[PDB]
Amino acid sequence: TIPADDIQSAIEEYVSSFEEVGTVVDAGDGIAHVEGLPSV
Amino acid sequence: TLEVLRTAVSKRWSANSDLIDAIEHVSRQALLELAERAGQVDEVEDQLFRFSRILDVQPRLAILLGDCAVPAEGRVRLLRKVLERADSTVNPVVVALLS
């Protein structure tokens, strides 16, 4: 059975449901790799 | 569960992840067996397919369910009510499969 209610508010119900430091994961010879920092 | 884990580790594997695929495949088989003994032997099939065709239309829900970093509890929260909506999901085993 398929829902045709088109009541996708559920998505909004999660849209409504929802400082930056990264971490060095490897380093050497003047190069580093940094996990995290999503908005660099 | 520990017995099936034992008989699972009892064989060699191509890689690391394939074992996780095998175990969750076993979970799938068990949920389907529960459904088959419940008399829903094929209702689960059409339920899965219709939900798949529903999810196919919406790329938003589809892709953001593939959040490779959000906590798995966050993922199941995402699924909860968009699945638990109405008669469109009357099957009581498909909930655990999709979860």
* Tokens 């009541």 -> residue: A7
Structure-determination approach? cryo-EM
The C-alpha angle B52, B82, B45, rounded to 5 degrees, equals 30
Q: How large is the C-alpha radius of gyration of chain B? A: 16
The answer to whether B78 contacts A14, with C-beta atoms less than 8 Å apart, is: yes
The answer to whether B89 contacts A10, with C-beta atoms less than 8 Å apart, is: no
- Cα B45 to Cα B87: distance, rounded to the nearest angstrom: 16
Task: Find the length of chain A.
Answer: 40
Residues after which a C–N gap over 2.5 Å breaks chain A: 18
A5 touches chain B (CB under 8 A): yes
Cα four-point dihedral sign B3, B8, B10, B15: negative
